[model samples]
Target: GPSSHNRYETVEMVFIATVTGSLSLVTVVGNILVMLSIKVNRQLQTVNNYFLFSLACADLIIGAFSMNLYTVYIIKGYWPLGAVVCDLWLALDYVVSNASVMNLLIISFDRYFCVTKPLTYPARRTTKMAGLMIAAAWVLSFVLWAPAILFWQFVVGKRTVPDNQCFIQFLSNPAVTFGTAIAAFYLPVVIMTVLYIHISLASRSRVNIFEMLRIDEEAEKLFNQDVDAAVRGILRNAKLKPVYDSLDAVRRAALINMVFQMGETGVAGFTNSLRMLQQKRWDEAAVNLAKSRWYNQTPNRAKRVITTFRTGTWDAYRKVTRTIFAILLAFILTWTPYNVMVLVNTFCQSCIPDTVWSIGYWLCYVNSTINPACYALCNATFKKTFRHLLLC
Candidate 1:
């Protein structure tokens, strides 16, 4: 129903050829660096980072073999090689892409446990576990897709793809294709999303609880000077000397911590609350603290501090959402269209022009091509190694 996009159909074919060619080169180099970076850096030599190495290897194949041949096929407008060559290429393509997703799947699971059960999880984690997880990621993805790619058309007793065509033949079976999409992409995607979200939310609660109780030395000067300046200026020399002995330790901590966060200018507005504080009335002062602009502005932290003020106790509470967020978004954005078009091209053919097909196909490639760049920009560890490799 559809025609393969020929590279020679447009004047931009020259640019396309150059770009696609460079993608393979860059993909191989980038993935090599991914391998070498971990090998050289002691900190990165963990079971956790080994998962990324597996992913990088898959991208390496997609970049080197799958992409280069696809570029050649697009440029030539037909498979110059015979049927078996096409089958092998298609097999590798399906295998590695699935493996890429599966590797990332384990990586998410690995990181999830790391954050969730920070102590116990790693006690049993070992290089052997790394080998099994990585081995399984490869074997599972292969068993999931490679045989299907290799045996499906010939085993199905018919074929839809022409001899000169390089397209995957399984696309003629809609139900099978749908299942492959779900298994390879959507299922792992959902699992990874939930796991990462939970990781950050878990990190949030624990980080806040631990960090809030342990005050940083750097902030004491700011807290003391700013709030005391407020008492001096706003409360008109409110006499810190008498207030310290009068205030209970927990109550004073609540007040000082609260004022430290809101700042002297902000807490100065709490005139009624401070007057209640001046009178040694805790609950009413906390009540006065509740009805304020800052409360709604920082609802959770505000509520916790207000709770601290009310109970007169030390027990109180709370971006990691971004680096992985940006990188994950990059993967989806780069890969989604190509996958959707695989369905469209298989069924409708005429729905997409040869131009759109080439774009989406190369866009598929850019997922692998761009991952090293994503690592470089998002992680300092990779960035330094990348820089070091690029220079000397």
Candidate 2:
């Protein structure tokens, strides 16, 4: 008789289980601390804090129930819950993910407000307004994820090898799968990218002012050198009197003009991209204007382009990019594989082995858990915060 083989080792499996369990615990604990610190600490209650608080709440909900329990069930290779708990868990999972998106959108909007109209932000972002915005986020998240409950929840019996698993089937229909993908991921991503680009461009503009200050300091040093040279020449009857440095504002003016001109040019490129996307030439537009130019001959044009990214442009562009990126990712990664199964079913009513399909399906599901981590790696503060709480 041949010995039975287990694909997943018990010891190694336990280690994997321990790591996920620890991560779940950390996510829960860290997010709770973040939310509580913002709410109870008087020093931490600002509009920015409101965004943090919203994100923390979403993370807490997901950590405690959705991610933690989902992983636990995967580790066990079966679910013990009945129809009700499965429905509830899937609904909560969908809700938390969607809520996270709305929080990102709120953050983008807040940043736009700060950069474009600093003076108006304080008046606009009162506590009451922030509270209302949070409420709206939850409400919208509920509405967006509610459809999943109607379609994804179903219970398997003990006769099934895995015993039980509550799952969202990737049925071939645009309304259910594609609609949720657009709402939860696509919209928020587009918004974030556009806003961040504008913010980065604005930040770079400040360097020009600093450069002008550097030049002024250099001018002072050069004048001292001239004075020393004159002193040496004075004794020789070459008759040198020190000429005072002229206090011309030419450098400062030039810096400002250069920055302004560059801003105008960048805005023009972004606006052109916007126009192309609006015209539904997404592929061609992205090729030309996604992130570069062919010729280096366009600094002035670029400044004019960027400066044209005015008050509302960042917010609007952010919204568009968020939607596009989210939708694209959701469609390609999550819904596409599941839909492939549906299409195969429709064409020949073919059924792949459960073992083969389950492996592929979970690979797709893993994408959702990893993308946010990828995003955090790009942000210095987020990277520090995540490592401080989770790694260190």
Scored by lDDT, the top model is 1
Q: TM-score of model 1 relative to the true fold?
A: 0.67
The lDDT of model 2 is 0.51
Mind giving the per-residue lDDT tens digits that candidate 1 earns over 1-392?
14855554566677768877887899899988888887888877877677777878888888889888888788777889888889888888877877777777777787777666544566678989988988887888788777777777779887777889877776656566666676677777788889878877763323322234343214433433554554344344244334433666565655555545665556656777766876877678777777888777777777777777677655653022354555567778887887687566556768988789778867877888787777777788888987887776
- Off-target runs (Cα >4 Å) in candidate 1 are 1-10, 158-160, 204-323, 342-350
Best by TM-score: 1
Model 1 weakest 10-residue run by lDDT: 208-217
Q: For each candidate, what TM-score against the reference?
A: 0.67, 0.52
Error of 2 at 10 (Å): 2.4
Q: Which stretches of candidate 2 lie over 4 Å from their true place?
A: 1-9, 151-163, 169-175, 204-392
